[PDB]
């Protein structure tokens, strides 16, 4: 939990970070395509707990340079990424 | 009068394969579509600015 992990839940292959879920899954629910037609949560086949499936951080990397004619120094921008993860 | 619109960026690889290792390699066979789309969207964003 809380680590970006590759998972296979009863053949449900995928990659993401699993965290404690607050969804009110009723007993007959096995997985949740909750919001925006996305498989937000899945039921644990053994502990019967519901885990939120989030795709671990991604982002576009942008490169800032003053020009090779000026210097080779470079600055890099990670768009939409909190600095705690880069 | 509107002056600008939202600046949108799309990762074509993720959108098409949804971060799956298998077809990410297959998508390479289709060429430079991703570069075209990225350039067009970047141009639109710079135009908004």
């Amino acid at each position: 939990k809380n680590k970006c992990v590759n998972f296979n839940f009863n053949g449900l292959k995928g990659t993401g970070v699993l965290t404690e879920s607050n969804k009110k899954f009723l007993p007959f629910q096995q997985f949740g395509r909750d919001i925006a037609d996305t498989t937000d949560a899945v039921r644990d086949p053994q502990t019967l707990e519901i885990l939120d499936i989030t795709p671990c951080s991604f982002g576009g990397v942008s490169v800032i340079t003053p020009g090779t004619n000026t210097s080779n120094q470079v600055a890099v921008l990670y768009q939409g990424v909190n600095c705690t993860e880069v | 009068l509107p002056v600008s619109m939202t600046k949108t960026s799309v990762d074509c690889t993720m959108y098409i394969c949804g971060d799956s290792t298998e077809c990410s390699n297959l998508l390479l066979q289709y060429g430079s579509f991703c570069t075209q789309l990225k350039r067009a969207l970047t141009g639109i964003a710079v135009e908004q600015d």
Partner: peptide
């Protein structure tokens, strides 16, 4: 106040913020 408002799609912020336009 009057006007109000992943899977690989994101929104980039404008260069000029609302404070600078003001």
């Amino acid at each position: 106040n009057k006007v109000t408002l992943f899977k690989g799609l994101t929104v980039l912020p404008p260069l000029l913020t609302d404070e600078m336009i003001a």
